[PDB]
Design an enzyme around this catalytic site. Structure first.
Site, mmCIF file in Angstrom:
data_model
loop_
_atom_site.group_PDB
_atom_site.id
_atom_site.type_symbol
_atom_site.label_atom_id
_atom_site.label_comp_id
_atom_site.label_asym_id
_atom_site.label_seq_id
_atom_site.Cartn_x
_atom_site.Cartn_y
_atom_site.Cartn_z
ATOM 1 C CD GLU A 1 -2.921 -1.340 2.261
ATOM 2 O OE1 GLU A 1 -2.859 -0.535 3.230
ATOM 3 O OE2 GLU A 1 -3.829 -2.206 2.133
HETATM 4 O O1 LIG Z 1 3.566 -2.666 19.406
HETATM 5 C C1 LIG Z 1 3.559 -3.669 20.424
HETATM 6 C C2 LIG Z 1 2.151 -4.244 20.591
HETATM 7 O O2 LIG Z 1 1.694 -4.839 19.361
HETATM 8 C C3 LIG Z 1 0.361 -5.364 19.492
HETATM 9 O O3 LIG Z 1 -0.159 -5.998 18.311
HETATM 10 C C4 LIG Z 1 -0.424 -5.204 17.140
HETATM 11 C C5 LIG Z 1 0.784 -4.877 16.255
HETATM 12 O O4 LIG Z 1 1.758 -4.102 16.957
HETATM 13 C C6 LIG Z 1 0.294 -4.077 15.046
HETATM 14 O O5 LIG Z 1 1.390 -3.837 14.160
HETATM 15 C C7 LIG Z 1 -0.776 -4.871 14.293
HETATM 16 O O6 LIG Z 1 -1.186 -4.066 13.177
HETATM 17 C C8 LIG Z 1 -2.117 -4.609 12.224
HETATM 18 C C9 LIG Z 1 -3.366 -3.730 12.143
HETATM 19 O O7 LIG Z 1 -4.057 -3.727 13.396
HETATM 20 C C10 LIG Z 1 -4.303 -4.216 11.035
HETATM 21 O O8 LIG Z 1 -5.467 -3.388 10.997
HETATM 22 C C11 LIG Z 1 -3.567 -4.155 9.693
HETATM 23 O O9 LIG Z 1 -4.462 -4.469 8.604
HETATM 24 C C12 LIG Z 1 -4.346 -3.856 7.295
HETATM 25 C C13 LIG Z 1 -3.181 -4.475 6.515
HETATM 26 O O10 LIG Z 1 -1.906 -4.339 7.147
HETATM 27 C C14 LIG Z 1 -3.224 -4.071 5.035
HETATM 28 O O11 LIG Z 1 -1.973 -3.879 4.369
HETATM 29 C C15 LIG Z 1 -4.265 -2.981 4.761
HETATM 30 O O12 LIG Z 1 -4.146 -1.642 5.257
HETATM 31 O O13 LIG Z 1 -5.516 -3.574 5.165
HETATM 32 C C16 LIG Z 1 -5.502 -4.307 6.419
HETATM 33 C C17 LIG Z 1 -6.809 -4.090 7.192
HETATM 34 O O14 LIG Z 1 -7.819 -5.005 6.753
HETATM 35 O O15 LIG Z 1 -2.379 -4.969 9.755
HETATM 36 C C18 LIG Z 1 -1.500 -4.592 10.832
HETATM 37 C C19 LIG Z 1 -0.247 -5.471 10.831
HETATM 38 O O16 LIG Z 1 0.328 -5.472 9.521
HETATM 39 O O17 LIG Z 1 -1.878 -5.128 15.178
HETATM 40 C C20 LIG Z 1 -1.494 -5.912 16.322
HETATM 41 C C21 LIG Z 1 -2.769 -6.105 17.150
HETATM 42 O O18 LIG Z 1 -3.304 -4.838 17.544
HETATM 43 C C22 LIG Z 1 0.367 -6.476 20.544
HETATM 44 O O19 LIG Z 1 -0.952 -7.007 20.699
HETATM 45 C C23 LIG Z 1 0.797 -5.882 21.885
HETATM 46 O O20 LIG Z 1 0.829 -6.916 22.874
HETATM 47 C C24 LIG Z 1 2.198 -5.303 21.695
HETATM 48 O O21 LIG Z 1 2.640 -4.714 22.921
HETATM 49 CL CL LIG Z 2 -1.861 2.079 -1.892
#
Ligand SMILES: OC[C@H]1O[C@@H](O[C@H]2[C@H](O)[C@@H](O)[C@H](O[C@H]3[C@H](O)[C@@H](O)[C@H](O[C@H]4[C@H](O)[C@H](O)[C@H](O)O[C@@H]4CO)O[C@@H]3CO)O[C@@H]2CO)[C@H](O)[C@@H](O)[C@@H]1O
Ligand SMILES: [Cl-]
Ligand SMILES: [Ca+2]
Ligand SMILES: [Zn+2]
Length: 509
Positions: A180
Site C-alpha cells: 500500500e
Molecule cells: O507494538 C507492540 C504491541 O503490538 C500489538 O499488536 C499489534 C501490532 O503491533 C500491530 O502492528 C498490528 O497491526 C495490524 C493492524 O491492526 C491491522 O489493521 C492491519 O491491517 C491492514 C493491513 O496491514 C493491510 O496492508 C491494509 O491496510 O488492510 C488491512 C486491514 O484489513 O495490519 C497490521 C499489521 O500489519 O496489530 C497488532 C494487534 O493490535 C500487541 O498485541 C501488543 O501486545 C504489543 O505490545
Molecule cells: Cl496504496
C-alpha cells in the site's frame, strides 16, 4: 416456490482455474493454496535482524512483533530472515504451493526493537537502516547489521540459497513491491512522511524488480499492492498525478504502461502480477459489509450476499461511493483485466487482501464461496484473504473449494460453462479436472434468505452422470458435512432443492 434453472456445458468455455486463488495472509483453520507475508508490518521489516515497525497501527513502535506473531523459535530470533523462513517453512509443511514475500521499498527498515520511534527520529535517523535494492558488492549469508544499509537482493539471495529459486519445488515463487504505497505517508509517516509520487513508485518498482530478477530470474514480481479504489484511480491524489496521469484513464493504466515500457527497455518482464487490495465498500442496513459490521443486521447480511457481483456483473450497482461515482470502472475485475489487455498483455492479476465481512456468519461463508468462484471463473491468478481464524464461515467457504471432504477433496482446476437463470438468488460454478469431465464439480450457492430454492439442472457432457455426492455448510454449522447423494439423474438432468442460505459442493460421476 422459487425455481431456478442451471445449465452446464462441460465442453464449453474451458479455462484453467489458477490453483493460487485460495490463499490467506493469516494462519487459518482452512486448507489454503497460497500464503502471503504482507500488510502494514512488512514495510519496515529488517531481514537482517527481524525487527519491524507498527507505524500508525501502534504508536510507531519498532519491536519483535513479527517474531512473536509468526511463532519464530526464540533461538532463531537473531538469525537473518527467521521471520520469513519460519513463514515459508510453515507453508511448505502445510503443502502450500505458493509463498509470496513482501520486500521493502518505502525506504527504511527498523534498526532496532527499542519501542516507539519519535517524530524527531523520522528516517533517516539512528532508529532506521536505509534500504538499497542492489548491493553492488558480493552477497553474504551473514549480513552486516552494523552498517547503515539493508539490501533487498542480498535478502533474496539468502532465501534462494536456502530454498532454491522460484522454478524449484521449494522456492519462494513471488515477491511484492512493499505494501500500500499510497498509504505510506499515513501508515508509516516515520519512514516515508511525504505522499508517494507516481514517478517515485515506478522508479522504485523497476529498480527493485531488476534487483530481484538478477538473483532469481524465475521469481514473479507483484505490484503495486494498492489499498483500494482511490489508489487504483489516482494513487490517492499523488502530488504528480496531474502531470504523469495526462492521457491515462486511471493510475492502473499508467502503472501497467510504465512497467511495460521499462520491461521493453530492459529486455525482460519486470511486472508479473498486477496486485491490488479489495475491501468492499458495499453497504446495507446503513453500514459497510466489512469492518465492524453487525451480523444481526439483516439488510447488511443481504447486501453482503450481493456484493460479490460488483466484481463481475455489469448490471449490479452497489450502495457505496464507488457504485455511485465510479460506474465507469465497474464491474471491477473486467476493468482491471481490460487495462491489462490494453497496456501490458500477459500480466497476471492478484487480489492480495480482501474481506467481505460476516466472517462468523453464514453470509460471510456464502459470499466467500461466491468470490472464490468468481476469481476462478474470471482468471484471477492469486488471492489471499485478510482475516484471522475466528472467521469460521469464511474458512468454510475456502474449504468448500480446497478440502470439502476433510481428506483433500477439491474443486476441479478447469472452469467450464455454468449459467444460472437467477443471479440474485443464486450462484453456480462448475469445473472438471484437467481436460477430463469424468467427474463434474459444482459449487451451488442459495442466497435466498428464508426460503429453499429448487434448482433444475441440465448438463451437456460427453459423460452420462449417475450420481452426485454432496457436501455443504449452512446456518446449522460452518463444518462442511456430507449430505444425501443425488441419484435420479435422467439424461444428465435432475432437480435439487436446497434450503435457504446453504452452500453446496456437488460432485457428479
Ligand atoms: O507494538 C507492540 C504491541 O503490538 C500489538 O499488536 C499489534 C501490532 O503491533 C500491530 O502492528 C498490528 O497491526 C495490524 C493492524 O491492526 C491491522 O489493521 C492491519 O491491517 C491492514 C493491513 O496491514 C493491510 O496492508 C491494509 O491496510 O488492510 C488491512 C486491514 O484489513 O495490519 C497490521 C499489521 O500489519 O496489530 C497488532 C494487534 O493490535 C500487541 O498485541 C501488543 O501486545 C504489543 O505490545
Ligand atoms: Cl496504496
Ligand atoms: Ca546491513
Ligand atoms: Zn477458524
Amino acid at each position: 416456490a422459487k425455481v431456478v434453472d442451471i445449465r452446464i456445458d462441460t465442453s464449453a468455455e474451458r479455462k484453467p482455474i489458477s490453483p493460487y486463488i485460495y490463499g490467506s495472509n493469516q494462519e487459518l483453520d482452512a486448507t489454503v493454496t497460497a500464503k502471503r507475508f504482507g500488510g502494514n508490518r512488512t514495510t519496515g521489516y529488517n531481514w537482517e535482524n527481524n525487527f519491524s515497525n507498527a507505524g500508525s497501527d501502534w504508536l510507531h513502535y519498532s519491536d519483535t512483533y513479527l517474531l512473536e506473531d509468526g511463532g519464530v523459535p526464540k533461538g532463531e530470533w537473531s538469525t537473518p530472515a527467521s521471520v520469513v523462513t519460519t513463514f515459508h517453512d510453515k507453508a511448505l509443511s502445510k503443502n502450500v504451493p505458493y509463498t509470496l514475500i513482501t520486500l521493502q521499498a518505502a525506504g527504511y527498515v527498523s534498526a532496532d526493537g527499542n519501542g516507539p520511534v519519535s517524530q524527531e527520529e523520522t528516517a533517516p535517523s539512528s532508529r532506521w537502516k536505509e534500504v538499497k535494492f542492489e548491493k553492488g558488492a558480493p552477497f553474504s549469508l551473514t549480513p552486516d547489521t552494523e552498517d547503515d544499509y539493508v539490501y533487498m537482493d542480498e535478502f533474496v539471495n539468502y532465501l534462494v540459497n536456502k530454498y532454491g529459486n522460484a522454478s524449484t519445488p521449494t522456492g519462494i515463487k513471488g515477491y511484492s513491491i512493499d505494501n500500500e504505497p499510497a498509504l505510506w505517508s499515513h501508515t508509516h509517516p516515520r519512514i516515508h512522511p511525504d505522499n508517494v509520487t507516481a514517478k517515485e513508485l515506478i522508479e522504485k518498482s523497476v529498480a527493485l524488480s531488476k534487483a530481484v530478477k538478477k538473483v532469481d530470474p524465475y521469481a514473479e514480481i507483484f505490484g503495486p499492492a494498492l489499498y483500494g479504489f482511490a489508489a487504483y484511480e489516482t494513487l490517492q491524489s499523488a502530488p504528480d498525478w496531474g502531470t504523469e496521469g495526462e492521457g491515462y484513464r486511471w493510475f492502473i493504466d499508467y502503472y501497467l504502461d510504465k512497467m511495460k515500457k521499462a520491461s521493453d527497455e530492459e529486455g525482460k518482464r519486470l511486472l508479473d502480477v498486477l496486485d491490488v487490495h479489495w475491501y468492499p465498500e458495499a453497504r446495507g442496513g446503513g453500514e459497510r459489509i466489512c469492518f465492524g459490521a453487525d451480523p444481526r443486521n439483516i439488510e447488511t447480511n443481504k447486501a453482503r450476499l450481493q456484493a460479490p457481483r460488483t466484481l463481475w456483473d455489469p448490471t449490479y450497482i452497489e450502495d457505496s461511493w464507488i457504485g455511485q461515482w465510479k460506474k465507469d470502472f465497474l464491474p471491477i475485475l473486467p476493468n482491471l483485466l481490460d487495462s491489462i489487455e490494453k497496456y501490458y498483455p500477459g500480466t497476471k492479476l492478484a487480489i492480495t487482501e480482501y474481506d467481505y465481512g460476516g466472517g462468523n456468519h453464514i453470509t460471510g461463508g456464502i459470499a466467500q464461496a461466491d468470490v472464490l468462484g468468481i476469481f476462478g471463473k474470471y482468471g484471477v491468478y492469486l488471492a489471499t484473504f485478510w482475516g484471522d481464524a475466528s472467521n469460521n464461515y469464511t474458512e468454510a467457504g475456502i474449504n468448500l473449494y480446497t478440502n470439502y471432504d476433510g481428506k483433500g477433496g477439491k474443486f476441479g482446476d478447469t472452469s467450464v460453462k455454468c449459467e444460472t437463470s437467477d443471479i440474485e438468488v443464486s450462484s453456480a460454478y462448475a469445473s472438471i479436472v484437467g481436460e477430463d469431465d469424468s467427474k463434474l464439480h459444482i459449487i451451488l450457492l442459495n442466497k435466498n434468505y428464508d426460503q429453499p430454492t429448487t434448482f433444475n439442472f441440465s448438463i451437456d457432457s460427453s459423460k452420462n452422470y449417475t450420481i452426485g455426492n454432496v457436501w455443504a455448510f449452512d446456518r446449522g454449522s460452518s463444518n462442511i458435512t456430507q449430505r444425501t447423494p443425488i441419484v435420479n439423474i435422467k439424461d444428465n438432468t435432475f432437480t435439487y432443492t436446497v434450503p435457504a442460505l446453504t452452500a453446496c459442493h456437488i460432485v457428479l460421476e
